[PDB]
Amino acid sequence: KPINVAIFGSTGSIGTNALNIIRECNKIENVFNVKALYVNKSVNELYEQAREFLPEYLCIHDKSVYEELKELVKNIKDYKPIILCGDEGMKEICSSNSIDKIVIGIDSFQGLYSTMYAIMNNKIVALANKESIVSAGFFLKKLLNIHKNAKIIPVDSEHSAIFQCLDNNKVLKTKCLQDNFSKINNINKIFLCSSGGPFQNLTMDELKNVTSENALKHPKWKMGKKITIDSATMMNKGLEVIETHFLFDVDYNDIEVIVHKECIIHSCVEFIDKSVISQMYYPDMQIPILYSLTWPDRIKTNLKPLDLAQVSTLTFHKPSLEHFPCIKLAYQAGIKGNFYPTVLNASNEIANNLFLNNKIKYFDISSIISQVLESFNSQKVSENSEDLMKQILQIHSWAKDKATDIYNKHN
Amino acid sequence: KPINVAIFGSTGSIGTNALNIIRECNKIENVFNVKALYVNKSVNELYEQAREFLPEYLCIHDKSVYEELKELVKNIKDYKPIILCGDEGMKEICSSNSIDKIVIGIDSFQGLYSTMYAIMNNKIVALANKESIVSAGFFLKKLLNIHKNAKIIPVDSEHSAIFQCLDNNKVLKTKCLQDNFSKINNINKIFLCSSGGPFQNLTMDELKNVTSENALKHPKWKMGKKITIDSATMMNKGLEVIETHFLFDVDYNDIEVIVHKECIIHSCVEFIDKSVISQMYYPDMQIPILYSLTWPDRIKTNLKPLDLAQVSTLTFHKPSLEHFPCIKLAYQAGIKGNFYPTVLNASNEIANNLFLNNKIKYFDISSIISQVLESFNSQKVSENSEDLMKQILQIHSWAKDKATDIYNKHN
Ligand SMILES: O=C(CC[C@@H](c1ccccc1)P(=O)(O)O)N(O)CCCc1ccccc1
Ligand SMILES: O=C(CC[C@@H](c1ccccc1)P(=O)(O)O)N(O)CCCc1ccccc1
Ligand SMILES: [Ca+2]
Ligand SMILES: [Ca+2]
Ligand SMILES: [Ca+2]
Ligand SMILES: [Mn+2]
Ligand SMILES: [Mn+2]
């Protein structure tokens, strides 16, 4: 019987990849009902999607375009959706008994907030937003212990890969973000594969002078600017190291970053017997998104089969921490624990955007982050969920301000 | 609590690797009990193993070395094993209530009979003898349908790999050699990895000249002569294609042989969504053997962790069927069904031995096997288990004789 899905951020990359794979899978067999779509402010794309999927719910965050949506929707004949606005509309979707699975494809406050509401309503939450896990991992873990039937299923490609390598008979005795997930699943170590970004062959001298244009003009996957800069510094991978720690409870000393430039093996799991299982496919966000929606089952697709003999050659090498010091900073913050990951994420948000806007240089990114981390002091971690969310927000804002102050002091 | 194990073929490659990993796993805790050791005739080696492991049962096939074994074992103080012989001894071990799992590391008839008795006693059978599956696959399927608590767990490295790639939550709802195994496991296709053997890069003119000495001196792994020659002709992979079909109920058109000369990825499974899972490690029979004894759990080993950066490069290519025609013969025999696999296996046993002994040339191997296949006339499959076994043995003998007659004629 059907899989009832809501997509939060339906016009973004995750959202459209999700609708695409749902559409194709549904051509083969009708398994998916799209029950809700939520967008920030892209009222026109949202209308086109509603015309096609006819969800029970439409919600737009920006009440300024609220009226226009209602107007556009009247054209669709035989169609009376519940049309909502803002955070209240998001809460209403997450509390719907009609909805089983929620795809979070938005960033920032909206992304953490909608994750939280989806967890509080005991839903299966398909989560691509690695910054929410890195910054607010303690809050999510706490929430997932309150709301026992809620589950986060990883969509970030490497984390999906890890999850796909597992025996569901063991996964189902635990869940992601739980202490002891790795022990229950007999996980010893993770190989976290990376594209390596555009700068793997550059020298230190070259890196000293690279620009955001260099990072953006020739990326490894056509993506948003921020994640593109993170891929270039390998701070994306550093964030994904912490994401691996929180999702799977794997110790930092058991997470190894490996540069796999062909981007066919998506990541690998070493079990306690030293057997290694890996997941592989062409680079394509459809498989991670689909698995998040079908887990613990798989359904038929019409995706192109992997031609291993055509790919011919897979390569692996260790990243240089001297060339990609952001990786080292992520491990440092992770190992220190506490709210240092919150600080790392927030400070990187600022330093990333400074580099993007040509205000600092490549090695200034890691210098700023490093100086912010050094200025933080560990905080008593609140046992109360409300207080803990407030701590995370306060530390997040402090850390962004601190990064900005460090930039302005030097500049 | 301990897992009680019998090893059939304790002094061969599988048996010694089995005892090696059991010994390491038993250092602190009693994880396994070695209850029984069986060999064909290596009484001196068996005695050394008995001294260490003190099994309840010893068994030798060759009755002519019984008195020798009895005299050796006298030297072991306060040890009173049950010392058995031949097929009757195999039956008594397989029947013992004190034995849970049986490792079959012997070939030919002793391998088939021991497998059969293990199944008849509803044991877990860790099967490394692929020829039994190829020659007697439908008979084993029939037996497994009668003896509903017996399970075959694959130990052949590539088939262990396939098995490990599956999701045990689905595996537990079926069993190897059971109709519908691939449907239940959402299997679409198999990538069956091969070393390629010593002759993989030879031209056709060079290949015409190869000898058994060439195959034996530069092998891809240190192993028995028979399998080394099959690795060189890629008849080993052909046999493994049929093994794949029977174990996993995967159609022949969905099994793709891939030459992966690094021998790190052991095989891969494509599921119906087109996601591919693979299993990898250094070549080492310990992981396949251990997993067959621990499945569906895993236990800690002290094996060297895979260093993928050090490996650095993995390669994949299609084998040339003009150079390795034994592969094509195996697909043809398998697709024909009936007793064509029995005939394939039996004719190969002769042709391999002829080549080993310098009596025929490389392309004569596939020529003889092809001629025996063409000569065989399909037979109605006996419905009775005992009748079917008799039919198998008859056709096996016929095909060896026919192969010999063909060699004799063109000599
Ligand atoms: O986090 C990201 C983006 C950055 C990383 C990457 C990985 C593969 C290609 C290019 C870039 P990095 O450079 O940090 O290794 N991703 O998860 C890939 C999304 C696209 C994708 C790739 C493989 C499988 C499915 C989807
Ligand atoms: O059937 C065999 C022997 C023959 C094949 C092979 C494969 C890898 C190296 C050498 C030879 P083929 O040449 O037919 O591909 N085997 O299962 C490998 C046993 C050794 C082994 C290898 C990998 C993992 C664990 C154990
Ligand atoms: Ca004697
Ligand atoms: Ca598995
Ligand atoms: Ca098919
Ligand atoms: Mn990623
Ligand atoms: Mn093999």
From Swiss-Prot, chains A, B:
Pathway this chain belongs to: Isoprenoid biosynthesis; isopentenyl diphosphate biosynthesis via DXP pathway; isopentenyl diphosphate from 1-deoxy-D-xylulose 5-phosphate: step 1/6
GO CC list: apicoplast
Binding site for 1-deoxy-D-xylulose 5-phosphate: K130, S157, E158, S195, H218, S231, N236, K237, E240
Cofactor note (record): Binds 1 divalent cation per subunit. Mg(2+) or Mn(2+).
Location within or outside the cell: Plastid, Apicoplast
GO molecular function term, any single one: 1-deoxy-D-xylulose-5-phosphate reductoisomerase activity
Alphabetical keyword list: Apicoplast, Isoprene biosynthesis, Magnesium, Manganese, Metal-binding, NADP, Oxidoreductase, Plastid, Transit peptide
Binding of Mn(2+), residues: D156, E158, E240
Predominant location: plastid
Binding-site list for NADP(+): T11, G12, S13, I14, N40, K41, S42, E131, G224
Description of activity control: Inhibited by fosmidomycin and its derivative FT900098.
Lineage top rank: taxon: Eukaryota
Binding site for Mg(2+): D156, E158, E240
Major enzyme class: oxidoreductase
Cofactor(s) the record lists: Mg(2+); Mn(2+)
GO BP terms in the entry: isopentenyl diphosphate biosynthetic process, methylerythritol 4-phosphate pathway involved in terpenoid biosynthetic process
UniProt family annotation: Belongs to the DXR family.
Protein purpose: Catalyzes the NADPH-dependent rearrangement and reduction of 1-deoxy-D-xylulose-5-phosphate (DXP) to 2-C-methyl-D-erythritol 4-phosphate (MEP).
Record's subunit section: Homodimer.
The protein's name in its UniProt record: 1-deoxy-D-xylulose 5-phosphate reductoisomerase, apicoplastic
Organism: Plasmodium falciparum (isolate HB3)
Organism phylogeny: Eukaryota, Sar, Alveolata, Apicomplexa, Aconoidasida
Gene label: DXR
Residues of the whole record sequence present: 76 to 486 of 488
